[PDB]
Design a protein around this ligand. Sequence first.
Ligand SMILES: [Br-]
Ligand SMILES: [Cl-]
Ligand SMILES: [Cl-]
Ligand SMILES: [Cl-]
Ligand SMILES: [Cl-]
Ligand SMILES: [Cl-]
Ligand SMILES: [Mg+2]
Ligand SMILES: [Mg+2]
Ligand SMILES: [Mg+2]
Length: 736
Amino acid sequence: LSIDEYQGARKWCFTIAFNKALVNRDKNDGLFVESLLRHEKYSKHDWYDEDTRALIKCSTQAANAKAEALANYFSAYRHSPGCLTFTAEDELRTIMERAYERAIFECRRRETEVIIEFPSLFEGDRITTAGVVFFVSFFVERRVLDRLYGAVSGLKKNEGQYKLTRKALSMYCLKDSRFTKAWDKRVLLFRDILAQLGRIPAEAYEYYHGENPKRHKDKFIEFALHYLEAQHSEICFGRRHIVRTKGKVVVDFSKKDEDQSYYISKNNVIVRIDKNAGPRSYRMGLNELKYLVLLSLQGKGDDAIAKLYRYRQHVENILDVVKVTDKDNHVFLPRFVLEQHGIGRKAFKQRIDGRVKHVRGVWEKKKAATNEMTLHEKARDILQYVNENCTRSFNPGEYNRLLVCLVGKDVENFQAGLKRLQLAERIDGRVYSIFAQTSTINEMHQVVCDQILNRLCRIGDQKLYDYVGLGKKDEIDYKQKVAWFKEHISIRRGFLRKKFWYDSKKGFAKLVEEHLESGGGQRDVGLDKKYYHIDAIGRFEGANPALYETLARDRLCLMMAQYFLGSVRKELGNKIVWSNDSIELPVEGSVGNEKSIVFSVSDYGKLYVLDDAEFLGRICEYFMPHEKGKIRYHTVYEKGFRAYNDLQKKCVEAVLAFEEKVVKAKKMSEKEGAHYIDFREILAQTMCKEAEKTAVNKVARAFFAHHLKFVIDEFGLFSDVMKKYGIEKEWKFPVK
RNA sequence: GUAUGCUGGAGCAGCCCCCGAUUUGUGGGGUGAUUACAGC
Ligand SMILES: [Br-]
Ligand SMILES: [Cl-]
Ligand SMILES: [Cl-]
Ligand SMILES: [Cl-]
Ligand SMILES: [Cl-]
Ligand SMILES: [Cl-]
Ligand SMILES: [Mg+2]
Ligand SMILES: [Mg+2]
Ligand SMILES: [Mg+2]
């Protein structure tokens, strides 16, 4: 259980993880800070306060030195325990505690209730098993950390606790596909589109399978932006960065940083079109984006982009003649413009009615959904109620502090917070008191829904229109608003549809299907069609509309994938064989009985195994020597990668048991001012021939680093030396 | 394609509802604003 209890061969699971951390720190020395900041690039809200961010920026050498120390400690029989001590002082400990409390908050606030406690990373000034798992997570792919946590967790008795604890501890891991030698990003986009399309649409997964992976995210926009930029040099989409409780989202059109994220806000992007006399910039929604993709795929991209470019000219012409212009042109103009010219004004009475109906509706739905809502949703509602009853509104610090109480199921500390607001005369005794009779987030949430609905279902008074936001003093000149509007134009919904398919009776989905059937690809989605329709419910009920739209956008993504593959160098486009339901690629090695690997649609998440071609070649050659031609991924995993992993555990356990026997038999000691005995210095004191010591070191190094850089004869010699020193294992290697 | 505080503008965009509909509609109505916005 404690980290001290892992001695000799029991260290093996840590040996494998930490050697991979060093394997990966040799590919990229920046991984500690990269991993700590990965999520915070996507957050307006600071993951870290200012001094924590400062510590993180300085920490690479410290963290890289600790990574090497622990790898040394876990890769030796006996190493000084000093490396397992982090003082309260320690930069790395502060960083780790902040990153971990942030990951726990991120897990808890997406749950509907707080069920479990999380393990401590430290006990006194000593790292725990959970602390060691957390430290290594920063350097390794998800699959390495899952393998470590699976070996060392005491929590697997409770599946829910095991997986939530794992979620927190693995928050900062690398994606399984993090490292590649591929230089053509069209190769990686091809794989990413295929992986996403092979994930089952969430709603269909829950119906057919609810208790391939589940699709969790819609990546249509991301893919569409990469495809439109690759096809149309005139077009460039806004990239996001955050300038540093809250940072500033800045949108720019700099391409220089390949991996920089596109700006996507509520299914809107910013497009810059460089035609004629200079660039023009628009906001474009999903609706216009998906029609632009459809038009681009059919060869009308240049024409569509010309019509978007000219859009601003039409708006500027209409703006001078709003009173007299055709009512059909009112669609391009925001409310404030039409209302300034006496078009579609509403009586304050009507504005009150619509506003109060809406806010009433919002709170009746919250009241009905309390048990299904997330802790973050419930906490935000409770905080809105307290904030709207405060003499002076929460500052960011006050808000954050109370949010942390509510998300953490700390109802005592939340109620101590209300007491402090009461003693400060910020809220009156009634507001403090309505919470006195509650002990749970759900109870508090119901009380708040009831207080708000009581306020909203009063016979309309002056206090009510202020409460629902109709009381604000607008002091901005119409002419300032018009000027702002002209530098921030958004494309009217249905614009491209009306320009190209005016008299079409075919919806978006049928237009996509007609292009797929007649366009010349003869491809369709590889997922079973039942994943895009529930036959048992009506055409328009529940998820069926959303799944039907998903079939059309997946078909767009397949055609984008077709464009990317078709665009890559013929050397690479001609080796691969892509069917509706499979990808076949050649495996290196196995000369005489040459080989290919066949990924089914359910395996497209694993196409990253192609990034280490030498390892896949040796896995097939050494674990599957008799197989020739086409091999299923499933077979490569079960007979190859799983077989390798089983052997690797036995060789690492063997090597550590060897060190223990040879250090204690030959009664060995460390140098004065050294932490462990070099494995060289241990072999130097063996009864082995040179050829035996060479092979032992090479086979050891291979299993420590997860590769196959040795020959079958050299494993023979390793196996001989283990047998000669008492440590046998059922190697099951070499293979029949 | 997470509204973690407050002020003010913006709902052409995004999203929702009603109506229509082998489905995502330049039909109708909303959206106490999500922000290529300006401030505390
Ligand atoms: Br290899
Ligand atoms: Cl990553
Ligand atoms: Cl490449
Ligand atoms: Cl009121
Ligand atoms: Cl098999
Ligand atoms: Cl070799
Ligand atoms: Mg405001
Ligand atoms: Mg609107
Ligand atoms: Mg605002």
